[model samples]
Target: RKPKTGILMLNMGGPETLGDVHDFLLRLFLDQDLMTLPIQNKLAPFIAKRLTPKIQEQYRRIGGGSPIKIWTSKQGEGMVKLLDELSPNTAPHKYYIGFRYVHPLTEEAIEEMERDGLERAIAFTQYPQYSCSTTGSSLNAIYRYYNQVGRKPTMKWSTIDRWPTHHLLIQCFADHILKELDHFPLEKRSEVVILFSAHSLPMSVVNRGDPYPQEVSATVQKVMERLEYCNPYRLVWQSKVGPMPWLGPQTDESIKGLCERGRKNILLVPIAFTSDCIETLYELDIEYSQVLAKECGVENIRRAESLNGNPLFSKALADLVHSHIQSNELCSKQLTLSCPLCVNPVCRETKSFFTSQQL
Candidate 1:
């Protein structure tokens, strides 16, 4: 394949339908090996057992299931098409979707790479903002799996851990907002307050110095700058879990607060989520939007169109890989790190990089 890459598009996979939720959440909770609280002997299954039913119920209310897997597959197909058009050089490098905790899994994708005779590949999580909890945790799973199951044809790799805000990406979000705003009365756009919300994590994770929150803030700030909105706006956290504090200015509170203060028009931009999953489809649009209307007396609550089909989305993915290739750094090489795997001192877990020699 001309020393080309077999791209593995990684994601925290979700159930494709309502019936899949039970097993989906089971895999999700059970896969949290990196979190100490999850893998403690009997407690592991115990927690998954307890949470699966409740989580499944939540998923059922939101369009009968999570659309993440299907949506992510569509993203892969779109990106592959885009690369075929613009990146003919990398076109022979087939792309495969790898689910972190579900079907079409990391191992499955690796197997495809092996079968395709494309050993070397670039691995990247769909997440634009990297975190030890998300991309870090998922990649660790892939490596650990690789260690136990054995290698695939002298595989080599590099990763685009995160790209906080690409210009075209920011433009995609800004463009989506303006497009959705067309549904509102023309004059209302002037009074609209943009609420850029991202998924939240426990402060404990952040207290340990996770860069996720900062990345989200920076991404939102840059998008706002690009949009050049003179009206009003705020960055808030949403989809928060656990009780031990979280990055706040919570979305629910922010939404109702804006409504209370006579802000009739609200535009919500789910900055973290890339697709119309439960968080965006049900949580924000249904649950939260209903609350904003009935309880908060909001006149208008609009969600920016998801960048699902945006060419810019595909372009960003291509740009991520193209930039890596142009750097001449991932030339059929692997890296296996030792003591100083990452410069971050707060990394609680130990892992080795796939050293260039490992290729």
Candidate 2:
């Protein structure tokens, strides 16, 4: 069908195979929008090359590639299908997977949308919580794409940067957590500790006033409220990439400490990310669940499943975009404000460009 609106599901793309892991890591490290290192042009490649072997093995165990690309494709397809039914004015909308690295980058997706003659575009972030490290990087990439090439004068644009505590989103997460909680015996249900884990950003970023931790906590709080505070929980962090200190009470340590303190029944909830990745499939599942469970001798350790193709999640997404389009805002108010310590001129320009757009 010819489309009336275009929705690009934005995310950090992962390597599809061992062969691409090196390049993928290189692309990731080179993006100054995401991370800064001393002499990054040289330092980034060095880190990427050295980490490739270990990262490749992590991907190898989790089914030979990252499911991110496929997951994004499936989610976009599902959300668009629902969007057509939910919003007729935006009906016949086409969805695009706007990955930051690897195949079908954001620039490529924008080019295709232009070619398709789409009149409007929505940069919808897949990250439920906002982080300059993740969503900020993606937005900067979009800005850079437009800056380097040029804007599509005929098309209007908007962004769905973050929706950490949407009601349906909370409902979906609550339902998944409820399902996982059922796996434990009824007597232990009330005692199961919920560890809400998110990929950690460096402390520098957090201290610099990144809103990710706060937004992530907001999601966790609402989910608890939805479940009527049925269980006890704590927010934790995971997957620190470098030597720099990151936000913590790391997941494994939390699991160990909780298990150590007679809190054996643990339900790990990935609150920040909507879909599975190395952090979920390997770091949480393999290392913490299996290996650490065995190490700590805990009999029950579970995780809420990632919301990959869940119909409820797609419905939530469609509703979100529908409301956004109806409101007619170019970007979130939060997006207009830079981090208190943000040093990137590119981010400032990107924010200005997005906020200053006109018909």
Candidate 3:
């Protein structure tokens, strides 16, 4: 089968500026098919009725708005530019950027693919690792639309949901970590603790054995090893929303604890986030900086620049798409859907997602 030569990049979207914040959150909460309660379909109007005022307040603190949409557009542009430089003839007609939660929605990207009359395609989420919550959720949404709309892209399709152990990924993080380390004098490098923070999930997910935390741990370990840093470090989660108990130790709490331990100079890394959005911009940058500096009495808080179309990162993306094209895998990756707790399932109530069956 000939591979579809179109490119579609999936990303968690953010508002472009301060103005897009409220509507962005409204969209974010509204688009959450998985996280919402059962009656949301019937009660959506009522729910949105009550949530606007409160959610808006949170958005104000986060960044006044999300720059995620524009930032993702830049990343798509970067990927297309890189692909053209590397393989000019076969690169996508025009890169399509899809967002799971907000503007430039998944269906819009797919519509573009259909309009371009693309025959085969390589699809990948921006997330580096395979978590049921993020990439899995995004892919599921795309699949549902494809199945229902019927054009269904009769193309040689390849998907790269996770690339946890890619060498380029290691190199990329190594560069970011080294860059962050440059802030401290060479003599003070050992004392500066690198905090790798990811978005937290409900502890319930861990009970089901989601690989997110472990994968993050592995990524961090590899990056730390690459840096040859024997300095003390830790992993934490940030931007935990909702009333549910999320995975911990929360980044803010960790910062406070580290401050109490006399660790003032801190270099934080948004390991889970590839681009500068609400999480990095407002959550870590503005929010944590104030908390760590004022309340915790910590001296400095630095964050690694988001993977905003860096050549290395874009190249990694291109390579991922390339590998998916060559492989004979739909939705790519050699996956075995046996566990009762499989990442994607048809029925949530009747069966365990990870069913123990031979694939």
Candidate 4:
């Protein structure tokens, strides 16, 4: 029989409770992988303290803290059950959650796997697109922790970097968008502009030739193709933080501009996100909804549902993992192939590290 395996689902975690917000921000700012400030050792803590009150108020509006951990836990449960049925001989496959900025950190997840006696692990990033800021940072932490702890059990590891055009993922997004479109009257559908929104990244990352923007556009293109009917849509960016200029046709500004130009109905689709968090709950529903109705002169603003735990998404995850296990090749690279803009040297090194391991 094959050795027991652990599947680590890595994500940018959020606060589980109101009280955890302070600690959450503290950890976020202090991570050099996430932020690279001047004298970050001292500066990050000061910035975190200054930002917590305002950030906490925003969290309070979204029913006190984020629901990311809860949703991730459910996704893990579904994937684990699905994996067993897909490959019964790999009967002991177990799933673990590793959050970069919060509870069950990478080290903790590894320790848990050790306790459960897992012999191999796969660091599957939840990000459908590869960005150095998110998946890159998380994988860096896992490797750093592994080296620091002397690499016990000589843990075999690999990664699922970017699956921008996965069939089931496209199906999930297309299905949800169609369902939301049905809510709009049939006659009004033609007027709708589908705002496909994703979280923004700094122009600095783009300038370094990161392929995130291209990948995000690819996802939108593929999903639109699968969509039942065509509606005018634009890929836009949201949730920008800090002082740097970020990638955009900013979502809020895009909506206002569309309204000014005489576009009326809008369907905001969180295309890049797999689950609903503060960005979807507060930023879109609470913040932007008010802006659209009050300032944009648009009353019919609707949002496509996030692919939280959609069965199709779960199936995609299972297929990705199983394909990698069976072929001993990274399945994420099997589509649209490589990152067209990945000039960052670390990208090559990271890929080499994972692919070199014997699964």
Candidate 5:
């Protein structure tokens, strides 16, 4: 029998409805990889129970909850279709989703692949830029599953950790921004500040030397190079959860500061997220933009659409998968080395373990 190949896309899932909010938070706060509480097994459950109500209200304002799953499904469809076209001889390729914190969880995804009798697999991180907390955590879940099952798939598996500066991916970002720029007056287009907003991580993660910040900067720089018009831009951070200080110029604060600095128009881009989620749809579109226009009097604060099911992005994914297959590599060569800046013991250990499993 010709071998079947599977693509497992990894992501952080969100609640699909108001009721799921509690479950979502429970899983999120409970994940030792994410929370890292002093007594995580005890503290996470308590914290989740206490905070579920407040988070539920926030979801209520945003039409019940996030559309991450919906967008992710669509993205999966695009990826599968493009993969078939990109590698026709490599038929029978299947795409599966592994949501770290919710339905269609990592173990479930693995089970489905096992049922399908996969002979090879690509555990692709949906996050274009890797982070220990995000990609690391997802892969850890998969590894744990393999260990618990005690009989892993007799197939080769690899990963796509980071694609910070992939050409087509950069082009798609530039194109989306360029299209949104047309909504502004042609004369003022060049003056529009492109605020590339990314999800914030606690400074503790940065202190551990995660390379996310620098990688995000590299992505932004590549997009700027593809842009047809020059626009002043600054990379800012958003969606800070805890009280602890996170990587910033926080998005809202940065927008206010931009207004104070006499920059009236802004183009908000959710650079860190591949799909529209609570952070992009509610927090950014509703919360931040409204604050900028209503309170700060900054007009023309428009958001660039995410690369959800964009064909160009699908092509980029296909290209990356093709490269990985040909090279028989775990991650792109540019990112094969463990993060030079990462000093976190867990990050180092996890990367080494996973990469060693690649064919």
Candidate 6:
């Protein structure tokens, strides 16, 4: 058996079935890395139980469950195949799907690495940008699992915390936007307003100086730069939970406002993520692009393709990880200062424990 390297790909996972939403929300609400509920253990289940029905309805609209798992599995496969070819010393690279909220959770990913007797492991976040709430949450989970009582194998660990400005990443996004833009009639193609939408962060996180918004904007900007700034564009927020002053020009409101200005044709780019999950598949595509677009007098609307199955995207993933391995850095310096207002002992400890490692 060949010794292997591990890439524990991390992301905010979604419920796999209608039966999973209740427990899914339950897990999400309970995560201190995400929510600030005082009586979370008590209150988390309460909110989860009550909100399950409507959230379940949203899932039903988008093919009955989140497609993230399927997308992640394919990406994990695609990227590693490239890794095997791109980095021969790390040949026979393996990936673990470390979903932050569901089955194949972070602990399970760790357990697999241990079982595989991995000599090296990288917590390669799929978020592309760093946020104490999203990528931070996922990385923190890996820290928890790696230090548990019975865990063995001092698996050498490193991280790829963010890659928001990767050149190929920008190229892939530009490619998708070009494809979506071409769908518009020639009369509206150049005139179509491009809305770069990402999952919104509440003020609690944003005020903490989380880099997600700015990093996403960098991704938005670089993609447009690649396109030579051919179209008008704005960065909008979506999927804000609870009313706590999330970053906005909320995507839906932005669409409606455009209609009032007599600008109809539009394109949405899910700039922050690579998968076609509930956010892209249901919220952006079905809810806003189809339903709200028509109700707002917007005649033409389309969403940019997710980077899930793109061979170039797979190559980008492989390149990012390969460079991380080549650099031999435990983690990026930017990741060390997780957030300005962050005072979590665990967050600090997690970064120290991983980054201070012998690299």
For each candidate, what is the lDDT? 0.72, 0.88, 0.69, 0.81, 0.82, 0.87
Q: Taking the tens digit of each residue's C-alpha lDDT, what string does model 3 give over 128-241?
A: 866666766676666667657865355545566677767788788789878878877777777899899998888877666676787788888888888887566899999887
Ranking by lDDT: 2, 6, 5, 4, 1, 3
How high is the lDDT of residue 343 in model 5? 50
- Which tens-of-lDDT digit does each residue in 269-350 have in candidate 2? 9998888888899999998999988899786899999998888888888999999989988889999899889888887987
Q: What range of 10 consecutive residues in model 6 has the weakest lDDT sum? A: 144-153
The better-scoring model by lDDT among 1 and 6 is: 6
Give the alpha carbon lDDT tens digit for every residue of 1-359 in model 6.
Answer: 46589999998899999999998999899998787887788999999999999999999998799989998889889999889989999878998998888998888888878878888899999998788888888878877765675563478898998999999999999999998888899988878999999888887678878888889888888898999999989999998767578888799889899999988888999999888899998889889988888789887999999998888888888999999999898999897776677877689878987877765
Clashing pairs in 5: none
Instruction: Identify the runs in model 6 with alpha carbons over 4 angstroms from their true place.
Output: 150-153
On lDDT, who's better, 2 or 3? 2
Q: Please give the lDDT score at residue 238 for candidate 6.
A: 92
Error of 1 at 168 (Å): 1.8
Best by lDDT: 2
Candidate 5: C-alpha RMSD to true structure equals 2.1
Model 5: residues with Cα > 4 Å off, grouped in runs: 1-3, 333-349
Model 1, 1-359: lDDT tens per residue? 45356778887777776566655555665655446553465676667677777767777777577777767767776666666666676666667788876787777887777667664577767888766777776666666666677663456766666677877778888889878778788878788888898988877677766768878887888887877765578888888776678888899988988888899789899998788887888789877987555788888898998878777787787777777767745321212221233444323232344333253
The digit string of per-residue lDDT tens for model 4 on 41-75 reads 78767877887888788889989989888888888
Colliding residue pairs in candidate 6: none
User: lDDT score of model 1?
Assistant: 0.72
User: What TM-score does prediction 2 earn?
Assistant: 0.97
Cα RMSD of all models vs. native, in order, equals 3.7, 1.3, 4.4, 2.7, 2.1, 1.3
For model 3, the stretches where C-alpha displacement exceeds 4 angstroms are: 1-4, 17-23, 30-33, 45-64, 85-89, 185-187, 332-335, 342-344, 347-359
Q: Give the TM-score of candidate 6.
A: 0.97
Name the weakest run of 10 consecutive residues (lDDT summed) in model 4: 330-339
Clashes of 6: 0
